[PDB]
Design a binder for this molecule. Sequence first.
Ligand SMILES: NC(=O)C1=CN([C@@H]2O[C@H](COP(=O)(O)OP(=O)(O)OC[C@H]3O[C@@H](n4cnc5c(N)ncnc54)[C@H](OP(=O)(O)O)[C@@H]3O)[C@@H](O)[C@H]2O)C=CC1
Ligand code: SF4
Ligand code: SF4
Ligand code: SF4
Lengths: 386, 216, 31, 199, 150, 286, 67, 157, 119, 363
Amino acid sequence: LTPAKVNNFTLNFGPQVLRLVLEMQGEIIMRADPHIGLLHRGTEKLLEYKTYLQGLPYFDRLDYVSMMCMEHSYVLAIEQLLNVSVPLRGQYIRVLFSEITRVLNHLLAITCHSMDVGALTPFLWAFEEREKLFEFYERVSGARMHAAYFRVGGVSQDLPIGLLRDVYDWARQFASRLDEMEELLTGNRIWKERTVDVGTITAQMAWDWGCSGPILRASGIDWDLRKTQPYDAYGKMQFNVPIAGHGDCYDRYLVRLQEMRESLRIIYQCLNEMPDGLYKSPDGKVCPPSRSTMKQSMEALIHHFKLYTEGFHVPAGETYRAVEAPKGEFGVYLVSRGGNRPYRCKIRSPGYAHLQMTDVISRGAMLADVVTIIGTLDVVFGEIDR
Amino acid sequence: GYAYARKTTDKDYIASEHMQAFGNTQLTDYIIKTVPKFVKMAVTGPAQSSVLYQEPTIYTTPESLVPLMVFLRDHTNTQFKCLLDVTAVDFPERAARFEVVYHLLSPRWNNRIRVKVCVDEVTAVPTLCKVFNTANWFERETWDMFGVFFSGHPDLRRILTDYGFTGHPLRKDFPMTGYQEVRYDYGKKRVVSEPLELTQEFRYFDFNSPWETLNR
Amino acid sequence: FEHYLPMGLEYRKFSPGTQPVKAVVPHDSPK
Amino acid sequence: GTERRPGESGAWKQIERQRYASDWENDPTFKRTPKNLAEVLDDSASMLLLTDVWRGMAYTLGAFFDKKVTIMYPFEKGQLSPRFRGEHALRRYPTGEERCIACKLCEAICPAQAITIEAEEREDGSRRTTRYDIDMTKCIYCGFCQEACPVDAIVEGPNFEFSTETREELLYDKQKLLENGDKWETEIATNLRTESLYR
Amino acid sequence: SLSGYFSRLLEASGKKSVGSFFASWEFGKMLVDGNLAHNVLVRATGAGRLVGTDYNGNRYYENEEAAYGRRRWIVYKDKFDYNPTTIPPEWHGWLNYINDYNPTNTQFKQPTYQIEASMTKTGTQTCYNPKGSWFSAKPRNWRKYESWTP
Amino acid sequence: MIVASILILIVPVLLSVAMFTLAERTVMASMQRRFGPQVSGISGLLQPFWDGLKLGVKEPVLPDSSSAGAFAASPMISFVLSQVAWVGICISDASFQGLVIMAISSLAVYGVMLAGWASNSKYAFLGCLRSVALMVSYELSLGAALLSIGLFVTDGTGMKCLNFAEMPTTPQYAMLPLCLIFLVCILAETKRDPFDLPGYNVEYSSLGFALFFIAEYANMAVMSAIASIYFLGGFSALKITALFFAFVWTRGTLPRYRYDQFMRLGWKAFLPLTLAFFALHASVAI
Amino acid sequence: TEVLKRGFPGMKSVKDMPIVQDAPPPGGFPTIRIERRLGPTGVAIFAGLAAIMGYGFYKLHEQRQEK
Amino acid sequence: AKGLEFVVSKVDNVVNWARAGSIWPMTFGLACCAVEMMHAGASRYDLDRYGIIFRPSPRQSDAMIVAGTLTNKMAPALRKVYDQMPEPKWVVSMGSCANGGGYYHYSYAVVRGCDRVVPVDVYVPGCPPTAEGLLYGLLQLQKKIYRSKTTQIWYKK
Amino acid sequence: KRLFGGAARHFYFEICRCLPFIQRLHKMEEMVSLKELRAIVKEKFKEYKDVKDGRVVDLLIFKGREEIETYLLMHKQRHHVVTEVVEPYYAKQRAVKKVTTNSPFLDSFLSSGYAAIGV
Amino acid sequence: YSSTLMTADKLGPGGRSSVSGITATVFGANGFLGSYIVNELAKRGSQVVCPFRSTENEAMHLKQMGDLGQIVLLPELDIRNDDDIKRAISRSNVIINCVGMRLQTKNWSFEDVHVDFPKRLAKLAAETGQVQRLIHFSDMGADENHKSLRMRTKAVGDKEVLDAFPDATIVRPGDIVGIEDHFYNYLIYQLTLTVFAPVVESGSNKIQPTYVLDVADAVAALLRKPDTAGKTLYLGGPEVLTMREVYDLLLKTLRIYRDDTVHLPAWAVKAMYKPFDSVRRMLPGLPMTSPLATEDYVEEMLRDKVVPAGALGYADLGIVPQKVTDGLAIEPVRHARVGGYRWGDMSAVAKDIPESVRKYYNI
Ligand SMILES: NC(=O)C1=CN([C@@H]2O[C@H](COP(=O)(O)OP(=O)(O)OC[C@H]3O[C@@H](n4cnc5c(N)ncnc54)[C@H](OP(=O)(O)O)[C@@H]3O)[C@@H](O)[C@H]2O)C=CC1
Ligand code: SF4
Ligand code: SF4
Ligand code: SF4
């Protein structure tokens, strides 16, 4: 139904993992057609052949920049159909480590955006604090990135003694690190002229384009899942919401920085309110027991045998749960048939929705701003291509 | 556009009492009474938005899906301005093996909803691009993964599989590892797909006890 | 203004495998 | 500062708008107009003579005379914890007998399918493995095997520098795993003496 | 202090004289390896003390005044083919900042089946190979049955 | 004799360009709370040498669908221009020596253009033009700045010329805005921040890439010597090193501009300012 | 079970089991800065620049007379 | 004759010295392991300290490190870029996804190890491997390059 | 006038219209002409000549549109043409009139203990 | 032994994960022909041993060609040492040799490569007792009464191998074409990058060039056929052409409008190549040296080099030799001219130019 005829303009933007095809009438972009699937690992079908605990590490490598947030949505989706209550200390730990993960995602995102723009110092500077928080992760789960810490009904292990000391010590100077980070771009005319009024987005388009996370906040939209649909101990937490009204790359930059500030505030509040008590749900028929308990009791040994081979049987049903991810709203749709494996597990990624805005946003822009669009979109193809 | 920042102070509250009570107890009944033709089956589920409430789920024919979505986005009481995603589920036991899924978010009233349409492999599903821009890529991915067609779409083509890939991997009958594997050949100097072969074949384990009652 | 990279003993003084105090982690509800 | 200015907008629609409409004036986030000679000179000092680059320059220059965090590998290493999940290894009892009893919990739990186990009863009546292989090129180092094993047989050792020139060297058998366990037993036992309070 | 600096340099390089040091091939390789030269001349020569010596001859030093993550460092005895694999595990934990235990202050339990540490054999033909490899002493046919022979 | 003098000029240029890129790396590391190249030789005093030898032993690849002669000659042409500029800096007595070097620098634009047309890369095709237009636009302002400088360059005999040895041995305190704009123009000429948006040599390799970098840093050093002679009141190693230190300082602290943005900046803020300053200097010097 | 783990000899009840976890020190951690923490007069800058430039102009005139 | 052989051996030593200490890889930001790779060049580890520079083109690239999973759709492009690498060249395999497929080894669209497409000189294990482990693997690559003797072979040809 | 309106012939005509541009863009001047390329496309159609649902034919045509479109934007490189277009033709015209006088059953028996599967 | 080699231990359909049960060692594997031979054997699921003299850098391309544990790399091979040869064939029932030389060297002469080493290899193969097939390679132009020293050494080595091992199979292909061959590439280096191209006499000598993949399938068939053991098979293309005709077709392929070739007497060519052939010894060898600048090449160009009448060829293997003048084998040489989009000034190529363009230029 369609011939080719006029070849004229032709472009190829990168096999190296985003492939981009654009259309210009010259120096100004008129069309932009991304092609994806170079990282589509078919995980959703792969999930069907794994137990709920077996498939948990799959969620580590969906957003390898922000991991515990990815774990949390799937865990909550399991638990809600399982009708399981999470202990207070576990909720505290989950919220605190989620804030740290959000800090890491914001740091890496802003540094990569800067390097794409042309600033290299903040990249290196912030990766030092990123290494600090990687050390924090390794201390608590033995893995730098793919912790697999979050568990159905709690977490794998309790926090080692002396961790909160170093957490507070890090927070005591993270504000200074952020301040020295800002002065390299905040008061710069070059950074603004590169970022100001590039990729303007409206509230109506954003809600039409399904935006989430900081991009939504920069359009004058009052929305945080942690305040509208709170989960775990986020309702108790008191913190502010940055708000911008231009939909600008500079605006999104400032919004992310203030989000980091609020994350630090929540980290402090969690640090000074850590409670003493159980960190795993007391239901041994879903939660694994202690090794000491397993080695001295027949019942816990039997439950360890069964759960670690067959696993708990989720009742048949369906649910969808989402989490206020640093890159937006990360949700997972769970379909239950009644067995020990999820029947159908659909994964919703905010970056995939944000990546769909390139063609309409890149219109009227320049090739120097496509990289700006991608960097400010804050997209990981691991979640985009599953 | 909605959910604009109005209050300069911190909010200790979520929504209003009357609106929340309606949306959590009589929302489904309101939907049923309003457009019963658009209603075919009703399930109020585990409340995607929050663990402590109830939320509905909609089943209908593909014929009236578009006006139903229009009303659900545009009704003064149902301002579902955010369509989260469109996906599908395979039910090989049924006459119609596909259950397409539609999810909505209402930041106006902190609510959510699920909409489902059950179809077979040879029935068209009118596209929701005219209602939501994001449906384009979701319809594309659903077609790529299951072959669910969407009539009237601007350009419906594969988005996630290989360029020359035929078949829909998320189908239940589709093999886990598939049929073809790809390797490079020095003689032809080209990277070529070849019949799938495994050094160690996959091991399937049957843990499902013959005593479990929850099996459905 | 706070300085990065504290000197010795001001950060992570004890290695994780040498905690000065024994750890008593509960693993069941007393009820 | 975060203020905005006319001409510093990086677009055409906005630039054309502000030079032909005073809409930016209604916006409070735009720096307000200078009103005297002093404010005009302040604006000129802001635009000309840089004065914005200068601050970041000075901060970077101070960073030049500042300390560093660089470490001299391999003569220096990093900081790690006993929970570290590294090279899988097989443990024994102090008398010398293998801890693994081929309950096959590790193979059952492993989502990587990287564990191949064959076993039968030993000549003494003992239940011992005949084939114990783990594919490190396939192992994801999740440690779920270490969580499932009820006799502390399989452990991810503190060894992480075990890269090989060929892929075949990573096809770990029972013998190499036992060698690794005998090598690294003391460190693993010391870590367990700490991890026991948490595991 | 020049005399103290040279005393530390001799006791770290393992030689007997400054003439023995500057004329040794280890110094010549130090003129081409900046990391090894930095070890020999800067980090070992600063303020700090020796901790202990392993059976491989490597030396361990600690400096409490340094910042975290850089207090401990080791000098390999094998000056031309230094490799981290030769560090014994009982020093590995203290080197890796995992525990505060070392042989000089902690008496561990030594199993009778303990295999000592050494250099890796990767890249060589003497390295480990699976039992179905061509380098194996006797090839294995893993068929799970016996073929009948006339 | 003349050939020997040329070679004696050549050797420090190559050695010091190697040292310049090494020190730029290392100072960037120092300003980034890291150490930089330190293993490759004593304190890393051997990195550029091994890098050059490595790119020497690396395989040169030639596209089969274009003219390879231009592909080879374009880095060759740029290197030749750099050597000629250095010779004119140190081995010249021309009355318009500054004008000679300005015209020489005008010629280096072609190498980027030659490479851009040479390879079959669309984004090379675009970036070569972008960099060409940037340097071409700033060349007018550089010439205007030299025009302003020439308004006071006089020898003892009373003839107005551009000889370097007759430049005053004092800084020109009365042309500081002119000096600043000239320094920013120099920054623009070398594709450095905030004008590093354009790379053009993407499909190049080996000693061709090495010669491109040699030409870039040699032109940077040439402009540094020009600035030192013009505004700093003499030609010396200390001033060269200080200017390079400041340039690394600026690179490590600033992001780059957009294409049309520095186009607008150069064509509406720099050239008119240089024109007005030239007119004022001509008026006062009367 | 847990009595054999956390219990002590002579323990009278299960409620007496001590708990030793990673906990904040008494009183909580000290407060931290959260928000952003932030020159020369343009008249003074212009005066200095003008003075330097005027000195340069005077030097230029003097050297021109000498030439 | 012995002196000429000695000169050949010394020249081989120098050639290995130059080629090992100036290895410039190319960036394939494929998946997880790239983040460890990015942190490896950061301030704490300083890949640049070891003569390592990441180049935008294969033409200046000395060796390839595979940091992330490889799909069937991406395999032709990876072979394309590797076939754009000039000689002498090497390949470093980092991560189980690159090693043998690992946690996607039974997927339908995953190339089970980058070995099946391109040769590999160094195999770095871990999911993800430590940046310290990547340092160790690249040092072992340097050790492999050290044992190389090219002009020794050529003189006896 | 034709079965299901004859959409299949319209699809074949459209693809044949678009064919020569593929030959010129993919350098098949020195392997094939328009005629035997058209024959290849014709033989592609014969795989489903016995379908009895118009809907299935419509979806087949739509997927064929996608295949020809990803052929049009060069998304499948020359190796795809090698592995699916011209080498299969060379094999088809190359193994003509083979000299094996054994029945296919006996061929399978001499081949292996199981029938061959896949291409 | 007859067909037990290819049938007894065959496991799987024949793919990469399949097992052919065949163990072989290939000498000269990293060479042009040996690389494709090894890639052909292993791809069917066979164990391959690859000992090499050159760098591991030049050999790494062979590592990918086999599965885990089926590529055996044996560095630092010494052809004067029989220990490495014994280790190379200690498990292989099949031996394949492609070690060949085209120019003499101060460290290796024609006899050393072409006579003594194959003879000792065959002796050790017979000593093993478990080897079933010994595959040796020679030239179609090999004859004991040739003036060319390399051809004479080749023929002598073939006779010696036949005497030592009765059941070894001799293969004598002619010109072999390929991406990295030693036939077309040097012809391009002589047509281009050079002022003038010498051609021996009239250059009407007849040769039968062939394709490498045909040779690989031929090796596979020879392993399949038992009767070919102890015989000699000659390999050639389906056409007979002269050096002049090949040069003309090459010029057409390169579309060069300037015939730079010249027909010269053989003595003139020898005198041209005389100075560099009397200095061939006492020299470790030099790069960028065509094998064409030798007197033995001139003697080759004075005789026809085609399959003998009644010789055993591709038809005996049930193999149809593909076209070498055109086809897929001609695409790589077309990439010197990229196949031709806008290269050169040529107008005679107006035959294949699109329609509307020719009416634009009105021919
Ligand atoms: N058209 C053709 O090419 C024809 C080829 N042949 C035969 O085919 C075989 C290969 O042809 P081709 O591969 O094109 O030629 P190549 O030169 O490409 O193959 C040369 C091989 O021989 C090896 N070799 C030579 N001498 C020695 C030695 N003294 N010690 C160790 N290895 C040695 C080389 O090893 P290194 O790489 O270390 O030198 C290289 O692997 C040759 O034996 C040739 O006689 C026969 C007729 C025609
Ligand atoms: S390692 Fe442990 S879990 Fe695995 S089979 Fe042996 S005893 Fe069982
Ligand atoms: S650590 Fe994880 S991947 Fe490795 S063997 Fe244990 S369970 Fe399997
Ligand atoms: S090996 Fe693991 S961490 Fe590395 S890219 Fe693959 S999944 Fe991610």
